[PDB]
Design a binder for this molecule. Structure first.
Ligand SMILES: [K+]
Ligand code: NA
Lengths: 247, 245
């Protein structure tokens, strides 16, 4: 069975009810291809709102969660709350969480374990910074990040891996499609060697670097790129073009 | 100073259980001399504001320091206002000590929240090792000063003292020890801002409070109310709302 093309739209910390309402209206109107899995991740205040307005064909993801079901953790939400709001995914280990808010691999691992235990799907994010790539340790970094995730996964059917080329985000650097493919191929090889062949074959590995309507078709044609985690462009009509990257 | 009772639900509840809690709060006759605020989990700010009677205000449990941006997992004061909430809790001990939020970051959050029209419940408090070293006064005054640097109009600010040194540590705070810290903090406001601000600013207590202890704590001259934890999820919260009655 082919890996189903997966496109996640991460709205990050953007939007209000009115503007997200318009965004959602555009997405509902768009004809999503068969065999294409679309997921939108609203700001945490709008998970409930977004699920109510979005067509059921589009799934909703939380942008983060914590590692227990309830507790004295002012400012956090649990997988239980996310599910209760009708969302079915959570983004974990996103570059912004790791590098702005200092979330450790250990913590991310604990979050993955809990989210999966609770019945959520997980979009698990990995990626190396510019100083890490320039030091020639891309492989070591993303393998270690993936290992911690893998150590906390008991069912990969609910997991999507997202590779973020952080070295090519906000640094002025650009990644070619071959550079994306190179990392994706290594990651799938890691899954094959450390988890199983079945998991390597079936697990979506999506690209989280710069992608546009003009570049998405070429990136999507790379053998080991299974879709995208889209940031800024997920807020624009351009997102529809990216959903249709296989058409 | 209007008595101020904040209920921090922390990371607790679902729509079913929180709907039941809200039903209880809506049924509660809220005293005219008491300002009540509830702080739901972030996923439920919208839900809570929808279901809660307008007599009770809604607070976010945290926010970030710009109006929009690439900060996955965060929300801005603009989103909070957009959901009908009028307050945000900042610098809560859990943010500082579990999620490593610095004074600097908290200060910047306060400045942005206030500039965007939100009220701020700004939390401070010393840990056990700090207290036993005899630097309570230092720790809280410094935390307060970073907040104050980022406050222009205090009409929208409430200071909350958390005796972190008494949370699961084996120590607990007497009403006298609470009053002691609160009295100093007011004098701080009198010293470095203005007597007006000191007289008008609510300084609420964020330590253990129960229906059984709230009246004695509330009777302390410089305790202007509470930031309630666990009890805020129970009918007992109404007893605490009634603390000055
Ligand atoms: K492909
Ligand atoms: Na009313």
């Amino acid at each position: 069975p082919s890996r189903k093309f997966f496109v996640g739209g991460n709205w990050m910390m953007n939007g209000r009810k009115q503007s997200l309402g318009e965004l959602i209206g555009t997405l509902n109107a768009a004809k999503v291809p068969a065999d294409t899995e679309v997921v939108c991740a609203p700001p945490t205040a709008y998970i409930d709102f977004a699920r109510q307005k979005l067509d059921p064909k589009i799934a909703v993801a939380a942008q983060n969660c914590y590692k227990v079901t309830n507790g004295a953790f002012t400012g956090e939400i649990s997988p239980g709350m996310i599910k209760d709001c009708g969302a079915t995914w959570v983004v974990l280990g996103h570059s912004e969480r790791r590098h702005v808010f200092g979330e450790s691999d250990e913590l991310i691992g604990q979050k993955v374990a809990h989210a999966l235990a609770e019945g959520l799907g997980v979009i698990a994010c990995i990626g190396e910074k510019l100083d890490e790539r320039e030091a020639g340790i891309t492989e070591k970094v993303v393998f270690e990040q993936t290992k911690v995730i893998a150590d906390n996964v008991k069912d990969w059917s609910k997991v999507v891996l997202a590779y973020e080329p952080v070295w090519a985000i906000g640094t002025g650097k650009t990644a070619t499609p071959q550079q994306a493919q190179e990392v994706h191929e290594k990651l799938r090889g890691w899954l094959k060697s450390n988890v199983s062949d079945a998991v390597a074959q079936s697990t979506r590995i999506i690209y989280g670097g710069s992608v546009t309507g003009a570049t998405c078709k070429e990136l999507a044609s790379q053998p080991d790129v299974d879709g995208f985690l889209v940031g800024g462009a997920s807020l624009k009509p351009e997102f529809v073009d990216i959903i249709n990257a296989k058409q």
